[PDB]
C-alpha cells in the first residue's frame, strides 16, 4: 500500500521572557519516530521508535542541527508576522508548519507538501506542482515574493521528490517488521436498550494499523447514515487505533442491521450482525 513521511512543527511565542516553545514531530505513516521539544532537558532530536535507533550518532547530530535551525527560523517568523499584522508584543501567537511526501505501493513519489499557518489559519502553501505558492492574504503575498526571489520552491521540490522519498524508503526497510505490517481490526458489536422501544447497536474496530478505516451500517442491505454516530479514529496508545460506529434501531429489529468494515489489513471487507 501507500506510505508517507511527514513532519509537524509548532512554535508558540512566550510574551515577557525568552524564546518560543518549539515542538517538532516526525512520522512515517501513522508511526511517530522522532521528536524535539525545546522544554526538554536533552536539547537533542530524540528517537520515538526502535527502528530509528539503528541510525548512528551522526544522524542524531544532523537532525539536531537542522531541527534547531527550524526552531530559529520560527522564532524570527513570529516577530516578522507580528510586524506584518501590526500586532502588539502582549499576546501569544502560533506558527505551524507541515511538510512531507507520499509514495504509492511501488514506493515511487506521488506528491509532496509544504504548508504554513499563523494563528491556526492558512498563511502560505506550496501548490501540488511544487512550483508555486498559494498566499492567503497580502502579508503572505509579501512572503511569496521573498520566497520566489530565493527560489524556495525549487529547493523544496528537490527535497520532496528526492531526499524525502529516499529516506522514507530507508525507514520502511529498516522498520519493515512493523512499518510494513498491517494489523486488521478486531471487531465486535455491543447492544444497549435505551427504552422499551429503542436500542443502540455499536460496532467496534480495535487494534488496527494503519489508522485509515471505514465503518458503515446497512439496513436490509441498503446504506444507513441517519440515526448513526461515527466517532473520530483514536489512538490506543500502543501504536494501534480504534473506532466505532453506532446506530439507533427499533427494539426487535436488530437483525436488519449490518456493520461493514473496510481496512487495508482485511483482504475482503468484513460484516457483523447482532443476533
Amino acid at each position: 500500500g501507500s506510505h508517507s513521511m511527514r513532519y509537524f512543527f509548532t512554535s508558540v511565542s512566550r510574551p515577557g521572557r525568552g524564546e518560543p516553545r518549539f515542538i517538532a514531530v516526525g512520522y512515517v505513516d501513522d508511526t511517530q519516530f522522532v521528536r524535539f521539544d525545546s522544554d526538554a532537558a536533552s536539547q537533542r532530536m530524540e528517537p520515538r521508535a526502535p527502528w530509528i535507533e539503528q541510525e548512528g550518532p551522526e544522524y542524531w547530530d544532523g537532525e539536531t542541527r537542522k531541527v534547531k535551525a527550524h526552531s530559529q527560523t520560527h522564532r524570527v517568523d513570529l516577530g516578522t508576522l507580528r510586524g506584518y499584522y501590526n500586532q502588539s508584543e502582549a499576546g501569544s501567537h502560533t506558527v505551524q508548519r507541515m511538510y512531507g511526501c507520499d509514495v504509492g505501493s511501488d514506493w515511487r513519489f506521488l506528491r509532496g507538501y509544504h504548508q504554513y499557518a499563523y494563528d491556526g489559519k492558512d498563511y502560505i502553501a506550496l501548490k501540488e506542482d511544487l512550483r508555486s505558492w498559494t498566499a492567503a492574504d497580502m502579508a503572505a503575498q509579501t512572503t511569496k515574493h521573498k520566497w520566489e526571489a530565493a527560489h524556495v520552491a525549487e529547493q523544496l521540490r528537490a527535497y520532496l521528490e528526492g531526499t524525502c522519498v529516499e529516506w522514507l524508503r530507508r525507514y520502511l526497510e529498516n522498520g519493515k517488521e512493523t512499518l510494513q505490517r498491517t494489523d486488521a481490526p478486531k471487531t465486535h458489536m455491543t447492544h444497549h436498550a435505551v427504552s422499551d422501544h429503542e436500542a443502540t447497536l455499536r460496532c467496534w474496530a480495535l487494534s488496527f494499523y494503519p489508522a485509515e478505516i471505514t465503518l458503515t451500517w446497512q439496513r436490509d442491505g441498503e446504506d444507513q447514515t441517519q440515526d448513526t454516530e461515527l466517532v473520530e479514529t483514536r489512538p490506543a496508545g500502543d501504536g494501534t487505533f480504534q473506532k466505532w460506529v453506532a446506530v439507533v434501531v427499533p427494539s426487535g429489529q436488530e437483525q436488519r442491521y449490518t456493520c461493514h468494515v473496510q481496512h487495508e489489513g482485511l483482504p475482503k471487507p468484513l460484516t457483523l450482525r447482532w443476533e
Binding site: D77, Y84, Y159
Partner: peptide, 9 residues
C-alpha cells in the same frame, strides 16, 4: 530526515 534549511517569512 529533515529538510536542510527553511526560509524565514
Amino acid at each position: 530526515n529533515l529538510v536542510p534549511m527553511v526560509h524565514t517569512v
